[PDB]
Every structure is written in C-alpha cells, then in structure tokens.
Design a protein around this ligand. Sequence first.
Ligand SMILES: CCCCCCCCCCCCO[C@@H]1O[C@H](CO)[C@@H](O[C@H]2O[C@H](CO)[C@@H](O)[C@H](O)[C@H]2O)[C@H](O)[C@H]1O
Ligand SMILES: CCCCCCCCCCCCO[C@@H]1O[C@H](CO)[C@@H](O[C@H]2O[C@H](CO)[C@@H](O)[C@H](O)[C@H]2O)[C@H](O)[C@H]1O
Ligand code: SF4
Lengths: 70, 174, 98, 83, 155, 51, 114, 95, 96, 115, 318
Amino acid sequence: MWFEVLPGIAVMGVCLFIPGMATARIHRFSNGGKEKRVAHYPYQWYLMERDRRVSGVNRSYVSKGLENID
Amino acid sequence: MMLYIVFILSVIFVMGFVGFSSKPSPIYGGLGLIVSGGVGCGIVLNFGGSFLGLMVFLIYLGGMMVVFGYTTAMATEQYPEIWLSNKAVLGAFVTGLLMEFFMVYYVLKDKEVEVVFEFNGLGDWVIYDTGDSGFFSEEAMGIAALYSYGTWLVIVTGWSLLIGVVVIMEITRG
Amino acid sequence: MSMVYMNIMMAFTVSLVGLLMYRSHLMSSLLCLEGMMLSLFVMAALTILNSHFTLASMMPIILLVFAACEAALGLSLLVMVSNTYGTDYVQNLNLLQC
Amino acid sequence: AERVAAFLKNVWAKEPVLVASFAIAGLAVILPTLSPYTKYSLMINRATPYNYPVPLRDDGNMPDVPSHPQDPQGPSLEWLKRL
Amino acid sequence: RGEYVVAKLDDLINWARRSSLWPMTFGLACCAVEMMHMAAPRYDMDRFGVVFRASPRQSDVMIVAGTLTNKMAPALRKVYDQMPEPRYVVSMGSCANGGGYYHYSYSVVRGCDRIVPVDIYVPGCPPTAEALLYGILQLQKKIKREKRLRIWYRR
Amino acid sequence: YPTKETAHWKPPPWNDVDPPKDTLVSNLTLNFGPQHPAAHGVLRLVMELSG
Amino acid sequence: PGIVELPSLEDLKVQEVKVSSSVLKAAAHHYGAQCDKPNKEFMLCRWEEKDPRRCLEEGKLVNQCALEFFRQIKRHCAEPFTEYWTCIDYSGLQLFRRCRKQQAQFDECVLDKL
Amino acid sequence: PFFDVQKRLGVDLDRWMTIQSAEQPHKIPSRCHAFEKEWIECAHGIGSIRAEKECKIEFEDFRECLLRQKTMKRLHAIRRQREKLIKEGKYTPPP
Amino acid sequence: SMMKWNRERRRLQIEDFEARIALMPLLQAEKDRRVLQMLRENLEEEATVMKDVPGWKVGESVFHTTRWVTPMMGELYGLRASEEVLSATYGFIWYT
Amino acid sequence: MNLMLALLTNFTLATLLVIIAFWLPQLNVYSEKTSPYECGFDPMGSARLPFSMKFFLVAITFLLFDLEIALLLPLPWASQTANLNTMLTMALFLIILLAVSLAYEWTQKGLEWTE
Amino acid sequence: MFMINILMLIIPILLAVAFLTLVERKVLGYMQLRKGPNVVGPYGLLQPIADAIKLFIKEPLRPATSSASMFILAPIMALGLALTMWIPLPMPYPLINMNLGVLFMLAMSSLAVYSILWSGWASNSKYALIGALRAVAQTISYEVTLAIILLSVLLMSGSFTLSTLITTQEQMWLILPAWPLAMMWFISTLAETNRAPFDLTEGESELVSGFNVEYAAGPFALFFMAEYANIIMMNIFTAILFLGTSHNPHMPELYTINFTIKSLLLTMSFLWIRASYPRFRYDQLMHLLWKNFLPLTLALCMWHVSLPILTSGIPPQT
Ligand SMILES: CCCCCCCCCCCCO[C@@H]1O[C@H](CO)[C@@H](O[C@H]2O[C@H](CO)[C@@H](O)[C@H](O)[C@H]2O)[C@H](O)[C@H]1O
Ligand SMILES: CCCCCCCCCCCCO[C@@H]1O[C@H](CO)[C@@H](O[C@H]2O[C@H](CO)[C@@H](O)[C@H](O)[C@H]2O)[C@H](O)[C@H]1O
Ligand code: SF4
C-alpha cells in the first residue's frame, strides 16, 4: 500500500530537518543565546568590531547597557 | 600566513597560467585556465569586489565549457599531450615553475624583490584602506552606475554584441 | 609596488609568451588570448578596487564583454580553418607565402 | 484591421509563445509612461539617505533651511507614509 | 577474539552483497521475456533490491537468459570479464544450461559454462518467472554462505 | 628574382580559389549493441556517426 | 619632508560611551533629536577642516552630550529602555520591525517623564 | 580627442569616467581624491610642458598616494630594523 | 501584494538609515580619537626602534603637502600582532 | 576562514571516500577486465577521434549571450538610482537588442543544427 | 563550533540522499503498480545501507585507456561541489551568509558541469564521450535562461542574498506574482540536474550509461550521491525562491518544519515527473529553451524591470 512509502519519506524528512535545526541552535549557543549577527555591509562590521572592544572580553556578542555608564 | 592569502592565491594564479601557456592538449589547457579563473576570483574578492570576482569566474566557466566541446571536435588527436608527454611542453612548464619559484623565494626571504622592477614583499594588506563604515558596497554602486552614468557604454557594448551575432553567422557560412 | 602586482604582471607576461610561441593547435593559442584577458581583468580590478575609484568599477565588466566577442570571433575562424583542412594546425595556414 | 486581426489569429494558432512574448514586452515599454505611480519610484529613491547629510554653516540668510531635524522646514516624507 | 569479529564481518559484507544484487541488462532470447516478467509488478524483483543496470561496470550478476551462439560467445565473455568483482553468473533455461533444443546445432554453444563460470542453473524452457526468482533467491543464500574473511583469517 | 628557397613557389589561382582538400573527414564508428538496453541484447548494430 | 604633528595621548583622553551597538540603535532616534546641536557642530567641523586633529575639542562635546543623554535615560526610563534594546539585541540584523511593542513602552516613557 | 565632438556638441560620452575626482555615485570619494584635485587644479590650462616642471610637487604626492612606494620603504625599513633588534635582545614590543 | 509590501520595506529601510545618521557623529568622533592614538603609539615605538640609525628622522612625512592624509593599513597596524592586523584587513570580507 | 574550512572539508571528505573505495576492496586486475567498454565488441578506432559538433553555431552564440547576463545581473542595484528615466531606457534597450539578435539568428536558421 | 556545524550539514545531506534513493524506488514502484524495496529491513528501510556498503567493497576499475588523474578527480569534484551548494542555504540560517549567495550558486553549478565533462572525457570511451558532449549541449541549453529567470525574481527581492528572499515573501509566496517564471524555473532545474525527461548525459536507453559508463564501485557511488544531492538542493532552492516560509526568530524550528515539507514535496515531483513522461531528444531540449523559454524569459525580464518602477514598488537595496 502507498502508505508503506511514508517511513522512507519520514526518515528523509528528519535528515533534512537536522541541518536547519543544528545551525540555528549552534548560532544561539555560540552567540550568547542570540542570533548570530549579520554584517553584509561595512557599517554593520564596524559596529560589530566596536562591540568587540566595548565588551571588555573581546566578544562582539557580549553587550553592555546602561550599567556601563557612570 | 593568512595575511598572505592574496599572495598565495596569486602564486596559484601564475601556476595555472604556466599550465596552459605551455600549451598541452586544450583539454588540460582549459583546466589550467579554470584554476586561474578560480583563484583570480579569490584575489579580486579579497579586495572587496565579490561581484567582479564571481562574474569573471562564471563567465570563464561558460567559455571553457564551449572550448571543451570545440576541442573534442576540432583540436583533438590520438594521444593528447599532458605536460609530461612532450619535451617542449615539459620544458616550458618547468621553466615557468622555476621562474615563479625563485621570484617567490626571494620576495619572501627579503620581504622585497626586483624582478626587472621593484616590488615590495611586506604583504598586500599594508595598502588597504582604513576607514570603511558606509552602509553599502562600493563595487555594487559603481557597477550599478552603468545604467545611469554609462549610457554611452551601454550603447556601444550592446551594439557590438548584436554585431557579434551577425558576424559569426557570416564567418561560419560556406 | 605591492607583491601581488609582481605575480599578476608575471601572469600576463607568461600568457603573452605563450601566445607568441606557437605550437600546432590553433585552439591552444586561442586559450592564451583568453588567459591574457584574465590577467588584465584581475590587474584592472585590483587597481580600481584598491583606489576606491567607484565609477571605474564597471570597466572590468566591459573588459569581459569584449573578451567574449574576441573569443567568439576566434572560434568562428577556427571552425572555418578546421572545415577546410580537418585539423586546427597553424602550419596549414601558409598558402599566402605565395 | 482585417489584415491584422487575421494576422494575429494565425500567430495565436501557430506560435502562442511568441504572441505572449511580444505582448508582454510591449506592455513593459508602454505602461511605464501611462502609470500615475512612476513618479514616486524616483522620489523614494531620492528620499533614501545613503549618505550623511552634511550641515550648512548658518550665515544668517537661510530661512528655508532648518536649525533642527524636527523643524517644519525641509523636505517631508508625509507623502511617503500615506503612499 | 578475531574469530568472532571476522565471523560478524562476513555477515555484514555477505548481507550487503546479497541484498543489493544488480543484474546486467543482458538477455538473449525467449528466456529474456520471463526475466522481464520477473521485473513486472506481480513479482517485482526490485522489491528484493534486485535492480537492472546496463553497464557491466555497475553490475554484480550476469543472467544468461537465452541461447548463446558461437557468434555471440566472445561478446558475452567480454562483458563478463568487464564486470568488477565479486561477480556471479546465473544460467537461465535449457539453452544457456546445456544447449537445449539447439544442442546439436553447428552455431550454438552447448552450455554457457563453456564460456563463463556459473553459480546457479535455472531449469526450464523457459523457466517461469517464479522459477527464475527462486534461482535468484538461491544465489542470495549461496552468497550468505560465503566465508571470505573467515578463510582469510585462518590463512 | 628566383632563388633556391622560392623554387617551389607557384602563382596563385587566377580566381584566388584553391581546390578543396580531402584530409579525412571520417565518421565515428560505434558498436550499438549487442549488450545494450535498446539493442534487444543480440543486435550488433554497427553505426557510422557524424556527431 | 616635515614631521607630522600628533596630539598627545592626554589630549585625546575622553570619557567614552561604552554601550553596545544595540543600545545605540535603540536610542538612535531620540539621540539624534536631543543631541543634534553638538553633533552637527562636530560634523560641520570635520567636513570643513578635513582634519581629525582640528576637531578634537568639538569631538569631546559629542561625547559629553551623549553621556548626559544616557544619564537622563538611566534616571527615568532605565527599565523600559532595557527591555527595548534587549529585544533589538536579539535580532541578527537588529531590526526595528521586530520590537514595536517594547519601542512603544520606551517611547511613551521618555515622552511622559522627559 | 582627435575630433572633440563631445566638447563641440556639449555632450558627455565618456569624460565622466576619465578621472577619479569626477562626480561619483552617492558622493563616494576615491582614496586619492584630494591629491588628484590638487594636481589637476595646479596644471589646469598651462599645458603639459609647463605642468611637468611647475606641478611636480603636486604630482609626486599624487603618485605617492597612488602607489604608496615611499610609505612601504619607510615601513619596510622599520620592520626590518625591529627584527634586527629582536634577536639582539635590544627591544621589547609593548603589550 | 508585492507593491504594498515593498513600499513598507522602503519606509523601514529609511528608518534604519536615519538611525545610522543619528549615531554617525559619535562614531566619527570615536574613530578620530582611535586613529590618532594608534598613530601616536606607532610614533613612540618608532623613536626607540630607529634611534641609533644614521640619519633617520622620527615621524617624517613622505608627503610634501602638510595636509592631513588618511593612513593606510600598514601605517596604522604597522607593528601590532597579526591577529589584530588580520581582523582589521580581512575580517569584514571573511565574516561568513 | 569559515568558507575555506567548509570548502576544505567538502572536498577532503570526497577524497577520503575515494581513497577508501580504492584501498578497501579486493582487486583483481587483468587486461580483459580493464579494456574499454563498447557493448561486448572491441571498439573501432580511438575515442579521441574528432566528434562533430552540429550545434557549433549555438555554442558560439552562447558565449555572446552569456556575457549579456553579466551585463543584466546588476539591474536590481541599478533600480536604486534616482535617475530612473535613464536606467529604464538603457535596461530595456539592452534586452531588446538581445532579443533582436535572437530573432536574427532564429530567422537566419542559426539555431538549427547542421546536417 | 563551526566544524561541528559543518558536520551537522554534510552528514544529514548524505543520509537524506541515501534515503531519497529508497523513496524514489518506492514511489516509482507504487506508481508502476508494484511495491519496490520491502525486504531489506522493514519497508525496505535498510536498502540504502546495503547499496552503500556493497558499492564500497566492490572492486573499482581504472580503464586501461583512461586518463588516470582526471578519472579520479572528476568524481571527487562532483561530490565536493554538491556539498558546497548547501553552505549558503538559509534553513532559516545559512552556514555561510553570503551577500551574493545566488551568484555563488550559479558559479558552483557551472563548475559542477566539468565533473561530467572530465569524467566522460577521461574515460576514453565512446559512450562516455557521447554522454559528456550531451552535457555541453544541455548546459548551453539552460544556463542563459536559468540566470535570467533568477534576475527577474530578484528584481522583486532586491538583492542576491538568499536570506532576503525570506523577507521578500513574508506576506505572500512569490509564486503568485511570478508563476510564469516558476514554471520555466522548475523545468530548468530538471535540465540543470540532468533529470528526466532531460536525463540525457546518462541517457540509459541510448548510451547504456553515458558519461559514467566506465565507473564502478565507490567512484560510481560518488556520482550517484552527487546527482541526488543536487536534486534535493535545487528543490530547496526552488522552495526558498517561490514558496517562502515565514520565519519566527524565536522559534526557528517552525520554519525548518514547514520549509522541509515544501522541499520534500518538490523533490517528490521530480520522482513523479520521472514516472510520467518519455525523454526529450537532446536537440529538442535546446530548441525548447532557446525558442520558447528564452523569448518569454527575455520578455518577462523587461516586464519585471518595468513593473516595480511603474507601480512604485522597488524593493529596498538592503
Ligand atoms: C533597438 C532599440 C531599442 C530602443 C528601445 C528603448 C525603449 C525605451 C522606452 C521608454 C522606457 C522608459 O519610459 C519612461 O520611463 C520614465 C521613468 O522610468 C518615466 O518617467 C516618469 O517617472 C519618472 C520617475 O519615476 C519621472 O522622473 C518622470 O518625470 C516621469 O515622466 C517616463 O514617463 C517613461 O516614458
Ligand atoms: C523583447 C523580448 C521579447 C521579444 C521576442 C524575441 C524573440 C523573437 C523570436 C523570433 C521571431 C521571428 O523569428 C522566427 O522566424 C521563423 C521563420 O524562419 C518563424 O517560423 C519558423 O520557426 C517556427 C519555429 O521554429 C516553425 O514552427 C515554423 O515552421 C517556421 O516557419 C518563427 O516562428 C519566428 O519566431
Ligand atoms: S531455453 Fe527455451 S525459452 Fe529459453 S531461449 Fe532457449 S528455447 Fe527459448
């Protein structure tokens, strides 16, 4: 019966799900729980490099708020 | 060694050129021109021109595909020559590799070299601009200007491609 | 100059010498013409990109456009040389000595 | 009329792909002229601020220029919000 | 224990080889029609993992399905030799088995085992598609009995 | 001015047309079968191909 | 051919604004409104002088106004601002369109109190 | 041009790309814009023969900006000198 | 449908561009101080490195004009570590 | 570095699989096995002999048309120009001329393969 | 942490490809009133593993007349470039975020053709040569149309970034405003991936096996693996282009579920189409693209240049 084809489709589907799920979770893990920053243009890279210096730990994704003003 | 990426790619660029300039079978000549078009893409891309580098790579991939088809039809023989099959091919290939090797060796050792002319071997990074923080790509805006500033260029190139179609049909008709 | 210029100019010289030193296949030499454009494209692109000369960013594209016209014309003649002789050898193209 | 209506039906019968091709290409050339919205396309492109707006040295005789971004003077994008 | 490991590894490679048998698209006469019927929906050889492929380079089994003539004999040997190993031959039908009803002919090879080694002989003129399917399953069980790595171990 | 090197030179054709050559414009020959899906397994179709 | 003058390190010493780009982007619209004057004075000086060394004093007033601007927020709207740029900071592209609700809370706070 | 039809007809076929200080898209300036402006304005209207001598100062600077050859010799000498001291234990680069 | 959404996307792009324009004076002010400090540091370490050399004058301009010139990557990151030079030169181009 | 790592990993894994494929199986090499394939009979002549191209004219045209796409790819960026009158004209001018050349080659029978 | 991400990409791709072969055999089986693999494992689930192991313990052959280096290079390049086509795909986040991700894929797709050309040529065999030259003809047929179709669609997206296609289709699938392009694109990907009714470089019933007739065992498997990896990748590319999935930044897995379903269903249609039609003759493929798709693609490119300008709906550059 045609539904005997589904188990192969399901296994193929789970395999194709993993790359999309893995990349999303890894990006959160590597960027302190946020989306990885996108820097398509030089301005966005400039702001990233500033955040790397401003952080104090050389990590562009560690962000400082009003607690860093005196 | 990563600060010398552009130089390393340019070494492979020359090796590809020596590959097809020694003129083995055009099958292998095409391959060397593909390798040179690949690293050439990387060299241009590393100066901020991703579009230009990708275009030349794409255009030469199409051109070499047609050359391959023409080779099997019009430039083949029983025993196509690799670089080792012919003394003239091998001799030209060896000479180019040795000339390139001694240029690379001396420029690296001294951080400078004179190959007829003076070249600085400090690495290509030193000449880069230090103040980029615009929210666009300068290569894109320059290329995009072909349709606003480059009216006259569009006309002559557009005409030449039309004439190219006309002309190749005249030439190849008996 | 920068050390990248040494290799790109070397590449242009290699393909020029490959062009002037023929063997037999006319196709092999037509490749050297394509190579010479590739070196000219790369060297022009580097100078324009490094100097930030924005409007000149389009001329390497124009360079490629006329490279294809030049290559297409070269292939058109190679076809006609092959039809006449059955090979693309350049030694066959010697009727005009006399 | 009868020459062309006859002509069109022939090509419609034989080469509908080319009839569709020429009809679409003809519209692209013609409609931009008859469209009331074509003017906004250029206004939106100019209203996009890719560059910093370098201020002018106030010499005392510049009423049409504003002193602050929130002043009434200067171009407004109210037409753009509505659009 | 090496004995246990090589025993298991034979099971693995034997299972892979018998579970993925790709016969050469090769048929000679009548018996090729019954072979086509074995691929047809009722028996569906593909459901066993048995897939026809045209190239000898990509084939594991030669089913000699029909009469082998003297004119065709070198060609059959050529395509058998061009099969990568391991390779198996199934002789299908009386003609391929021993010449059959053209046995005394001047132009007929009296059995394809004069030309190639044969693993399974399937009798019939023609064997029914089911008789051939029985022969293929018999080849699978033969492959299942192979002891390549056990014999290598004890060398 | 005749020389040894130009001894073999001949005047060009009156109408500038040199005779067509026949350097070998040979066809490709192909065994289409017997072992071939479309050859029914016992047809050696020897086929001369141009392209 | 002539040495290049440089300011002393002490000449370049200022109290920097140590907040991340997401904080700046959250405050950018109000910051442009509240600090337009020293900002435009400094920009006018750069495009006229064409010299980073001839604009240092104007540059320091950009910082002093920015720090004052951020101290005002910390006084009155420290919490609603924190939710707002935190939401901006999550986005890979730092999009305004993903945070309109927290922007409203921040906007109605500075409007009401400042 | 051999026939200056562009300047006759008041049409701009290609003068817009000739120099890098010309008006660029979105007012993006070239790296050597100031040097080219200064050289061009120095030599305008007096002819090449005079400009070669009289605008030499502006041209060498423009050339220095374009190829940066004297900058690299100054940096090459320092980098070479620093390593000549590193081995001799006579220098400690800062943190 | 595509016309309406693209218009909205254009309005959003302008709002994002204006946010950048608001912050540019601060970023520019910071860029000027950073460039001048890095040059000041390089000058001080040139002084020691090229001290006993015969005729060297420290911090000599290669230009006749006294006009300000933007430094190139070598002049700014001349002596610093590779990882900092590599980030400054190729970091943007190599970022994903 | 991410991209070069991704490229290095992709082709390394492919190379590793080839290495396993060539060094893990049992080999049995002899002349008849490795001879060229041609349906059971020995090939007539070499496979390096010339193979006529009947679409030679289309292949050359592909070169000229492939450069057009390089000229047309920047159009999404060109639509951001304020000078929209000029770009639209020149954008349409280029495409029409590309269409004209196709019409010329089509009508002159350049798209039909030689016999 | 990036190398782990790379492996969480390659390994699923290869496993998805392996089980695509099972799914194809089953779907063709049932569309042909039979069952397909159902003995090797339950419901034939282990059939792909048996095929993979079998092929890699099969003796590989180097033909006596082949050019050894290009013979080995070509299958490596095919699989290596097949995996490289996946690194810019946003699902919803790409492994490598590229400004010109669309162009990168055009370049890598064009370079993947040479794995057909050089494998077929390096074999030094007539059926492999014929198959290779069919690849030249088939590339000449589709690429010019294929890139111009992308250009027409991107005139609504506004950039060559693949992630921007998600933003473009937040309110609606692009298949509505561009279904004429979606049809010609879908057919182009069939020819791009050498799939029926355009399965001409292998052309089994005419060329025995075409460009890979001389390949056996592992080297053959690489071409098979590359071919099926490009089936999936180009149907994912189609889903991103024309059936955009909404992205919720805080629950990206919802995107990956809906996105995966669409790509699977598109991949099924490749099997569905293979089960339904005969094969084009490779000169008829060229005339399909150059005399039907190209005239209409050129016309639609003009239309999609003008339409945003005349409707004042030009997309943002960023
Ligand atoms: C083989 C040779 C082929 C040559 C073919 C050339 C075809 C060119 C046809 C004209 C195409 C452009 O047509 C023209 O476009 C511009 C903008 O795009 C429109 O311009 C309109 O909108 C713009 C801004 O959006 C306004 O600045 C302008 O005032 C207004 O009139 C014109 O109303 C229209 O007439
Ligand atoms: C601006 C973009 C849109 C513009 C479209 C550009 C492409 C135009 C295509 C060429 C149109 C005229 O050129 C072409 O000439 C031949 C005559 O040999 C016509 O007719 C011929 O070709 C068709 C199809 O091959 C055959 O069915 C017919 O038997 C034959 O008479 C074509 O139907 C016509 O298409
Ligand atoms: S064995 Fe019988 S059925 Fe088979 S080929 Fe011979 S005669 Fe025909």
